[PDB]
A = this chain, B = another copy of it.
Amino acid sequence: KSSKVVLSEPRVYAEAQEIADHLKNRRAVVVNLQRIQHDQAKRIVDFLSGTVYAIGGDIQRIGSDIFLCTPDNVDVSNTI
């Protein structure tokens, strides 16, 4: 009865695979593309947009070029 949050900073769709592999284990991942080139960041998001959904997870934008990836076993909300 526990969860995980993993900080992931890929530079290419090929490395973004690691994010999906974490999701397959019902882990949450923190994706920061702030230091990632325009084309690199895009390819990562495009990759994840397909893959993350397909494997039960989803993507939440939480800041400037920063996203989270979570499995179906995690809810998303907000507050102020």
A interface, CB within 8 angstroms of B: 1-11, 15, 18-19, 22, 28-30, 32, 34, 60, 62-64, 66, 68, 70, 73-80
Report Cα–Cα, A73/B3, bound state, in Å.
7
Which B residues are CB-close (under 8 A) to A60? Answer: 5, 7
Which B residues are CB-close (under 8 A) to A66? Answer: 62-63, 66
Contact B5 A28 (CB under 8 A): yes
29 cross-chain CB contacts under 8 A: A2-B74, A2-B75, A3-B3, A3-B28, A4-B74, A4-B75, A5-B28, A5-B70, A5-B74, A5-B77, A6-B76, A6-B78, A6-B79, A7-B78, A8-B79, A8-B80, A9-B78, A10-B80, A22-B79, A28-B28, A30-B62, A30-B68, A32-B62, A32-B63, A34-B63, A63-B63, A63-B64, A64-B64, A66-B66
